[PDB]
Ligand binder design. Sequence first.
Ligand SMILES: [Ca+2]
Ligand SMILES: [Ca+2]
Lengths: 123, 123
Amino acid sequence: ALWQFNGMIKCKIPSSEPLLDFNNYGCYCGLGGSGTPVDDLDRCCQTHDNCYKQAKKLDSCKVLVDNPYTNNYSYSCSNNEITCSSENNACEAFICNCDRNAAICFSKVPYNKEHKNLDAANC
Amino acid sequence: ALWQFNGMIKCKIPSSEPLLDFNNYGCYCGLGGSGTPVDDLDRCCQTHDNCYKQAKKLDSCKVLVDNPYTNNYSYSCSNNEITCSSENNACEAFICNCDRNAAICFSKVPYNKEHKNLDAANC
Ligand SMILES: [Ca+2]
Ligand SMILES: [Ca+2]
């Protein structure tokens, strides 16, 4: 869920408030997304949107009526590393991994304020 | 909460159903507990009851109206090891550790069916 993803990105970027800093960035970081990623942080977001859309094709995920930003899973953050728990059932485990990967991606790319609240005419 | 503790003990003992196998064992494994532990598994349970009672003295825990078996925290199980997450606030982090320790204790001691549903006249 949204609230596990928020903490995974602060696990990796402790100075950040992910829901403010990474929301509404580029063409993909945020609800939906279309067009060409404007940079690498945006490409991180596009890959995560594709991961979430892959998750929805999983038959395990067909039973999950709570769709991905409300679908709760388990993970821990320890010494700024993220671990998806084995108690996750297959669907939750797929979304956890989607989230792990996007948070780690976000910590490896530049952040460009120019792209914050980027006008949609760009996507 | 009860449901995080159940999974921590299956993290460590994967063949088990903790809520059936360790409930109502000796004088301490179960709600409450008084008397002398009948064995080492029971002493594991006494130490965990003392941990939970220590937790209740914490000032952090004073705000937690949901008392410990409903007080949810985060942890992961990976390769049969348990890790209490850093996103746990202090109270939850104290209970998580109480639970980590009891699950690891339960995996290191003998299990004695004689003590299963042990008559209270014994405690
Ligand atoms: Ca998006
Ligand atoms: Ca007890």
